[PDB]
Amino acid sequence: XAXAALXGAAXAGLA
Amino acid sequence: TTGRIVAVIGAVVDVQFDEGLPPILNALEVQGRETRLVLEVAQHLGESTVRTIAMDGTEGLVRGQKVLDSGAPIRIPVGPETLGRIMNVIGEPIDERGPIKTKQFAAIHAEAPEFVEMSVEQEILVTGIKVVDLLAPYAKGGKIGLFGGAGVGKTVLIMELINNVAKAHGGYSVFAGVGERTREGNDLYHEMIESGVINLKDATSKVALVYGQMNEPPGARARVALTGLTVAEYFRDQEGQDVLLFIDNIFRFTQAGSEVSALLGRIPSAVGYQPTLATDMGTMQERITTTKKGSITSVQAIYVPADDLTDPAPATTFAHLDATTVLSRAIAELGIYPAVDPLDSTSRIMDPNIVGSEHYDVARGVQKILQDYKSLQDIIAILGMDELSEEDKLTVSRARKIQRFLSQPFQVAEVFTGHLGKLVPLKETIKGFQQILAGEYDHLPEQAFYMVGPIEEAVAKADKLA
Amino acid sequence: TTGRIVAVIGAVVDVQFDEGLPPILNALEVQGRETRLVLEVAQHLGESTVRTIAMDGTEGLVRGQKVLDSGAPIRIPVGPETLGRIMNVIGEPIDERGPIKTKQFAAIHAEAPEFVEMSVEQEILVTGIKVVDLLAPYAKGGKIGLFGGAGVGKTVLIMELINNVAKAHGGYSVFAGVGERTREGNDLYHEMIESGVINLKDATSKVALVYGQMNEPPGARARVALTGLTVAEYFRDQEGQDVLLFIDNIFRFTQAGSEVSALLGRIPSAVGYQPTLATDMGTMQERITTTKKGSITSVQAIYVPADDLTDPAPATTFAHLDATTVLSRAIAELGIYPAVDPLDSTSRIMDPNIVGSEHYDVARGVQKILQDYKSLQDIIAILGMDELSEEDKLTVSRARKIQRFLSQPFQVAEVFTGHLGKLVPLKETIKGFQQILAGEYDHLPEQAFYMVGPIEEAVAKADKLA
Amino acid sequence: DLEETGRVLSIGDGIARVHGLRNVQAEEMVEFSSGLKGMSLNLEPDNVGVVVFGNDKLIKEGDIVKRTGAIVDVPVGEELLGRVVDALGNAIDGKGPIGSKARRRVGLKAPGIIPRISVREPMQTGIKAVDSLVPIGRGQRELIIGDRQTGKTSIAIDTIINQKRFNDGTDEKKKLYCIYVAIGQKRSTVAQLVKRLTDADAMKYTIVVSATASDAAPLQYLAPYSGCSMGEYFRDNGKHALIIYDDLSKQAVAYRQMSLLLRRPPGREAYPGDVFYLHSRLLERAAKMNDAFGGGSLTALPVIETQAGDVSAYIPTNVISITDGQIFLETELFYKGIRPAINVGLSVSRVGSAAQTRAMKQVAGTMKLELAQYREVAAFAQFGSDLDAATQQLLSRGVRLTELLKQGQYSPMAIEEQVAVIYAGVRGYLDKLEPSKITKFENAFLSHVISQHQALLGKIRTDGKISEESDAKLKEIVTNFLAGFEA
Amino acid sequence: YFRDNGKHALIIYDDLSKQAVAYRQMSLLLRRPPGREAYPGDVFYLHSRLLERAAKMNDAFGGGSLTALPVIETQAGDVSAYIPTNVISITDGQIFLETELFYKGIRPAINVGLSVSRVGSAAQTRAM
Amino acid sequence: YFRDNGKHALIIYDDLSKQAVAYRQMSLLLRRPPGREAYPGDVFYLHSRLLERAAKMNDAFGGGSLTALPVIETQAGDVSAYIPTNVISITDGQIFLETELFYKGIRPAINVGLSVSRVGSAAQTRAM
Numbered sequence A: 001x002a003x004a005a006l007x008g009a010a011x012a013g014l015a
Numbered sequence B, C: 001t002t003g004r005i006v007a008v009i010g011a012v013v014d015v016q017f018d019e020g021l022p023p024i025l026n027a028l029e030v031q032g033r034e035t036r037l038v039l040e041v042a043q044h045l046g047e048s049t050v051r052t053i054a055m056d057g058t059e060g061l062v063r064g065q066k067v068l069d070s071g072a073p074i075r076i077p078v079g080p081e082t083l084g085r086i087m088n089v090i091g092e093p094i095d096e097r098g099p100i101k102t103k104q105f106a107a108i109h110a111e112a113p114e115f116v117e118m119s120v121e122q123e124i125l126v127t128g129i130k131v132v133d134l135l136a137p138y139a140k141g142g143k144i145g146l147f148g149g150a151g152v153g154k155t156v157l158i159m160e161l162i163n164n165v166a167k168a169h170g171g172y173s174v175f176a177g178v179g180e181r182t183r184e185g186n187d188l189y190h191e192m193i194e195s196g197v198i199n200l201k202d203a204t205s206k207v208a209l210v211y212g213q214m215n216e217p218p219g220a221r222a223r224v225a226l227t228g229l230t231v232a233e234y235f236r237d238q239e240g241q242d243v244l245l246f247i248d249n250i251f252r253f254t255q256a257g258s259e260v261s262a263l264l265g266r267i268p269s270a271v272g273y274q275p276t277l278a279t280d281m282g283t284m285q286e287r288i289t290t291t292k293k294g295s296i297t298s299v300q301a302i303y304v305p306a307d308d309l310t311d312p313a314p315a316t317t318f319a320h321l322d323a324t325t326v327l328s329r330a331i332a333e334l335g336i337y338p339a340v341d342p343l344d345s346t347s348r349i350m351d352p353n354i355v356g357s358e359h360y361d362v363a364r365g366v367q368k369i370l371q372d373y374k375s376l377q378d379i380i381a382i383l384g385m386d387e388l389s390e391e392d393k394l395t396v397s398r399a400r401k402i403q404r405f406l407s408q409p410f411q412v413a414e415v416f417t418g419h420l421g422k423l424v425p426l427k428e429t430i431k432g433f434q435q436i437l438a439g440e441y442d443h444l445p446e447q448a449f450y451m452v453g454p455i456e457e458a459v460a461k462a463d464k465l466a
Numbered sequence D: 001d002l003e004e005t006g007r008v009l010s011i012g013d014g015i016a017r018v019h020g021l022r023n024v025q026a027e028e029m030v031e032f033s034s035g036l037k038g039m040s041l042n043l044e045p046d047n048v049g050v051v052v053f054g055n056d057k058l059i060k061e062g063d064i065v066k067r068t069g070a071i072v073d074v075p076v077g078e079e080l081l082g083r084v085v086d087a088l089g090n091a092i093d094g095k096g097p098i099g100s101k102a103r104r105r106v107g108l109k110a111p112g113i114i115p116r117i118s119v120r121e122p123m124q125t126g127i128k129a130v131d132s133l134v135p136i137g138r139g140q141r142e143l144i145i146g147d148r149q150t151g152k153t154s155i156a157i158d159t160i161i162n163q164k165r166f167n168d169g170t171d172e173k174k175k176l177y178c179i180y181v182a183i184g185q186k187r188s189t190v191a192q193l194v195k196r197l198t199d200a201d202a203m204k205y206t207i208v209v210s211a212t213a214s215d216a217a218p219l220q221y222l223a224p225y226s227g228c229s230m231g232e233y234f235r236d237n238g239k240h241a242l243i244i245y246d247d248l249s250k251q252a253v254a255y256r257q258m259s260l261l262l263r264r265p266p267g268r269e270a271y272p273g274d275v276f277y278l279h280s281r282l283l284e285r286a287a288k289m290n291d292a293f294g295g296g297s298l299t300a301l302p303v304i305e306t307q308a309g310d311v312s313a314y315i316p317t318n319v320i321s322i323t324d325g326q327i328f329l330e331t332e333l334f335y336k337g338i339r340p341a342i343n344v345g346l347s348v349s350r351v352g353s354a355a356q357t358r359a360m361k362q363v364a365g366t367m368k369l370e371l372a373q374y375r376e377v378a379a380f381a382q383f384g385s386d387l388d389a390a391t392q393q394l395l396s397r398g399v400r401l402t403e404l405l406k407q408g409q410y411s412p413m414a415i416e417e418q419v420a421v422i423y424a425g426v427r428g429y430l431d432k433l434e435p436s437k438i439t440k441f442e443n444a445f446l447s448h449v450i451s452q453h454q455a456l457l458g459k460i461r462t463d464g465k466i467s468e469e470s471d472a473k474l475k476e477i478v479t480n481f482l483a484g485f486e487a
Numbered sequence E, F: 001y002f003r004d005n006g007k008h009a010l011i012i013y014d015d016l017s018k019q020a021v022a023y024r025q026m027s028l029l030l031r032r033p034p035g036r037e038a039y040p041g042d043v044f045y046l047h048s049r050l051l052e053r054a055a056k057m058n059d060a061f062g063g064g065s066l067t068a069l070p071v072i073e074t075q076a077g078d079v080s081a082y083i084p085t086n087v088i089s090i091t092d093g094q095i096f097l098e099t100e101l102f103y104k105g106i107r108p109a110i111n112v113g114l115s116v117s118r119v120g121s122a123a124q125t126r127a128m
């Protein structure tokens, strides 16, 4: 949510 | 032709021509300025007036100011002499090493290799990197999404690749910094230098550096990637090598696109991006391929917005990627380097129909084991490592050996790792893992495999380890 | 009068007149064309120019081209000679059976019946459909609407209803295909022939067909509804005997309006729809109605974009119905057909003083258990049933049995259910539902209730399941 | 001469505003000084808005624009087969000019109600799952839908390739000329695409229109209409064509780009109000003509790319509301190793049963039934202890049947081959067997009956049904093969 | 008329949702730039102006009154919505009906929590 | 002035959010084209050109420096909104503050997990 972008590239192995 | 400035609104200059009107994309030169001001042509407003986007600050411009049609798009010094140099968006030197003296100049805006120039086949491009080559093989003229950032060996890996391309393919590399942080650029510069890839003394530099700093206006950060592209194209279309293109970061490209778009007053599309999002991207991506003459391979640094894989920016981008290289902080924490994630990193060419049944099987082998071990991981810690079967205990052992065998010493990091680098060959790579899977080295101990090259070293290390 | 084509943009043709300016809603005929091209006047732009909407493709038109004032609005053949025929927006045959030879013609644009003209009789219309009859019963001379996202069951339902109702009607029927599939028109036509509703031999057909499908330009799609509409009006007022009116899909008319709206030069409203959305729907819906002169039982399919029921199109439609059958993708995905949402479908007739208290009580009974089950769902979702109360578990069982008992095989959908269609009589429905509620079947398994007619069959199915 | 000519007033955002051209008709092709092409979109009181079919860099204020008196059209005819053309019909295989006799408007309205007839001829894919569970009829529109990389195009291909089995045939009525339209893709992909087609000797019967990632939005937008017109030639002449729109997703974005630049009100997802129509008009053109109109047909397999399996989005819903069924491929399935990752439940074929072969009816009929009873008990739950023999048994077919439906690429099967293998599973000849053996059984049991029993196959195939003898013969055939099967 | 003449009137505006749409239409067609959610920047005012008219006059003015019961249609039970809040912020309270309540057997589907009366007991008999 | 003359200077921008707004106001009034959140197409540039001016010089230049602490005010923790996105993307790291934390007793409310320093230990003393 709101600040998730500060994790990051988290679901990357899905792309 | 000599035009006048009819209007200045932020980064968008309007220029009127009395006699001949410059076609779209041409590069105009603003007359009478301390420094070079290039205006790229963007539209024909009718009435002998063009609408252009400034490649630098329009501060001080005056209605009536003189503009000289360079009668072409932005052209830049291309060739070997570029290697080891840092260059602007309009092919200027920004390293203070004097003029970039080349024979040829190459306009940045270029169409892509016609269908008849296309290669008809998929070939893996070997880097000598165990994980990469084994589980997520790069592809000639393909696009790789490089995930992960700091702490994790991003620069070091970028530097080894460069090296390994020069070594195993005699191919050079380009580095395009789209929206680079001035601080970080200079830091990249000296880092390459200390590692050799750049050589200020001789002519052994294996990389050319293109920079589009974050302070630059949208148009500049918009083009820099192309500029870098032009450069790489040369080592392919003129010398038929296998170039490497690094775009850092692919996101800032797209973003730069939207800014220019907005400035041009066009209505934004979904999520505010440019209506031309897909085209903007494709007219660029498509130039990156294997033609009959050679091939350009691009390593693109991706930044996913809001961690949303379906965001238009990222989504669009995936349409062009042939493989991902996921750098992982966790892996790094195991001391494992390169810190590439063997389970998250993927490749389109990982098809037996492409890498061959052998290669394909090994890969699929390494991965499953890696997967299985992952399962047990939870059990081990809680219920203790012992209900483990003669079978469950081997999957682990092997896996653990595997995880290590997947790590490796880079020549780039010799300067102060006090350890010799290793450029393992694809053949050696398949063999190595093949055997571990096989059970040939079950007797060998874990640490034997940590930070080595070819399996042979795993064996010798065991010796020295009693 | 003879105007000249001044401008052309898609379906919006602007025509200039010199002597007589045609009033708004008038149909003009473009001169110099292989086939008829009617233009419907939309507005007076001033300057002796009129903005119009083409009723067919505008390719080939040329500025300056001659246009003739027909002197009236789009008129079409009305009378019994339309029965068994297929006709255009503009009323021309499209069945290759020659001209429709009628005594009278009627213009598609008419005013809605006045207040004093309204009717207030409320008679239930039994359909044989379990969910419909029990929870949101239709009504003679009433307005029915079938809401549905893509491929949910709108059409099938319209067919089943034509089957279960149209077939044994004794009066006339009008089917209006609006913006849907041509193949469907063809599917119906031939079928209609087969069952004898359409007779190409005698004058015994009971159905008139009007079509303006998915392949027509916006203007056509924006008027076919009106066309079909008019046909029905005739039988209602001009002859006194009860009509049946089927439209598939009325959403298409609204969509069509949005297609031309920008061209008309209007500031778009919310979601990019035309600011006149509601009025447009209103002056049209208001003609689809029963009156003191005649009765019109209308079933309209209403496509819901992106499955969004809050979309201005469907949203604004609710207000015009007497009974609403909302179809659900979620339900459909569960395999329940028809995919009617039992807590979202409504009917003005659901009144004890109209359906009786037995009917009124079962209905509300079923809804309350399904509502209750709905609230338990969140929990069931993470933790399943285990942690549920013995009491709660019983509502869940019953609900899941009622849920299933609501489904049913349609003749029209036999090819898919793999079962023989069923038509349950109202008392049968009230009953079977009572018992379920009353715990008279807490012993039978859910599956027994799925896909069946009367409760009796649900008992048997139970035996067969053993 | 401002009657047949015009001078450009302004070029920008791919819309050239030409002065003059007083005689152009709406939608007529026009030519630019630079040999560039365009469409007359807007006919305004004092200019013509033209849609440039290429890079607008080439156009400048003042350039000459000449009519052509032709409403946008394209080369059409059998001489396209084996050719790789652009959205305009121009060859791009560098194989010499297309010797086309006929031409055809790209924007013709589809055939009405009267001239059509229910699809009744099978349009074999060669893919078991599809041909058994989601039968396509000739003249049907069946949508291929899924996320990126779920194996969408792959279905199109095997289908194209499978056609050779008839095209090399005797009977012209059993043939199918394919047309593969590429939109927004990578050339490197199209190039490899034909290479694969070429090596399969399928290009001989295929036309390829390409408007790729680098082509002007208007070309991408156009491409499907052109490919459609070419397919129309076959439909119109008692022949039978197959057109693949790959993808409609990218076309839609191309059109949207155009729309926004023209400044048309952006709606849901920023898409213009007419995007549905963009698709309906196109897809209406696929059709099955009756005998009095040539009995020919056009079959469309349009591709749509969903984001995160969201099958409710604006574009996907639009398309679903046009075609006559869909084949959704699942990301889950694909990774779990089930390929084609076809979602048996979700997918549909509104009109294809009638086009379905009896033989398949015979075996495939009790397949979804069995799979129906398997769909249930097959939970997400990986570790579940079960009871009940029946439900147990149900769960047991399910895994076998599922193994029968897996298929590699480039190896489209003959309908009779499909019924054969399906027969083995649906009849129980694989119940006593282990799910990991299924694949292996198939190849081995298939080569076996192909080698030894071309006799029974031909019957099945010829009869088109499974006769008592054929079935009797088949039963023993599985029987013995089994008995000898090495674990 | 009644209000100003010492009489008592009750007015039901069923519903103000459709009126706003009408307003929005009329407004856009006049070319007045569309505001939030496409409505004219003054939708609030459109309703305030109207509902302020409902009132209780003093004995000096006849002691008459005007009571208003305006209807608003939410979507997805969302009362926080812009129009719904616009109107909630004018009136002397609200009666909020939920479909959940309704189906559940709670009819009227009044949601006690979310409903209010800014008049309080002053509008009730002592008995009540 | 400090940076350039062998001296060291610290600068706090409080906030860059308000400044963005100021700029937006001007842009829109001048009628330039509006983008997401109504921000001009050169709002990123506005900050990048600002934040880059901070830097560590070389002895050849005086060794003087200019460190920057720019402040950004998020909304409901939406770090991904427009302006927060730019600035995050421009700077060498972030110190993320949370209300939950704050009220929970953690003061300063630094969310340690989500905060960063690209520069890292290269700026920490050996002691630390």
Ligand SMILES: Nc1ncnc2c1ncn2[C@@H]1O[C@H](COP(=O)(O)OP(=O)(O)NP(=O)(O)O)[C@@H](O)[C@H]1O
Pocket: C148, C149, C150, C151, C152, C153, C154, C155, C156, C157, C303, C337, C338, C339, C410, C413, C416, C417, D320, D321, D322, D348, D349, D350
């Ligand atoms: N009552 C039903 N029983 C069984 N299957 C059904 C039923 N209704 C629909 N289906 C299935 O769903 C498909 C679509 O039905 P259909 O009535 O055409 O949906 P629709 O809402 O008319 N679709 P569209 O017009 O494309 O949005 C049918 O072809 C069946 O496969």
Ligand SMILES: Nc1ncnc2c1ncn2[C@@H]1O[C@H](COP(=O)(O)OP(=O)(O)NP(=O)(O)O)[C@@H](O)[C@H]1O
Pocket: B351, D146, D147, D148, D149, D150, D151, D152, D153, D154, D155, D339, D340, D407, D408, D409
């Ligand atoms: N039947 C199959 N069996 C095994 N592998 C398959 C099969 N079909 C496809 N593949 C693999 O799956 C990959 C993706 O299939 P593809 O048809 O290219 O998917 P897609 O949905 O078109 N994805 P994209 O077009 O890239 O967005 C192919 O490149 C093959 O490697």
Ligand SMILES: [Mg+2]
Pocket: C154, C155, C180, C248
């Ligand atoms: Mg339908």
Ligand SMILES: [Mg+2]
Pocket: D152, D153, D246
């Ligand atoms: Mg594809």
